[PDB]
Paper text:
Equilibrium binding assays indicated that all variants bind αvβ6 with low single-digit nanomolar binding affinity (KD~1 nM). As a result of comparative imaging studies in vivo, R01-MG emerged as the lead translational candidate. Furthermore, x-ray crystallography studies confirmed a disulfide bond pattern consistent with the cystine knot motif. Competition binding assays demonstrated that the N-terminus imaging label, located ~20 Å from the RTDL integrin-recognition motif in active loop-1, did not adversely affect the tracer’s ability to bind αvβ6 with high-affinity. The half-maximal inhibitory concentration (IC50) values for the unlabeled precursor and FP-labeled standard were 0.61 ± 0.31 nM and 0.56 ± 0.46 nM S.D., respectively. [18F]FP-R01-MG-F2 was evaluated in pre-clinical models with either human αvβ6-positive (~3.5 %ID g−1) or αvβ6-negative (~0.5 %ID g−1) tumors. Selective tracer uptake was demonstrated in the αvβ6 overexpressing tumors. [18F]FP-R01-MG-F2 enables whole lung molecular assessment of lung fibrosis through expression of αvβ6, an ILD histological marker that correlates with prognosis.
Cystine knot peptides (knottins) are small (~4 kDa) peptides characterized by three threaded disulfide bonds arranged in a topological knot; this stabilizing core motif is known as a cystine knot.
Numbering used by the authors: 0 to 36
Write the structure that this text describes.
Amino acid sequence: XGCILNGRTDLGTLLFRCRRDSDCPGACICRGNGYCG
């Protein structure tokens, strides 16, 4: 697998700065803005 950032309407994504997918929690991936999703 899951990804705690999928499907949320807060700014949880902004707690997870990423430069690559492996910076992200669970099976989340790094998105175009440099934060996980």
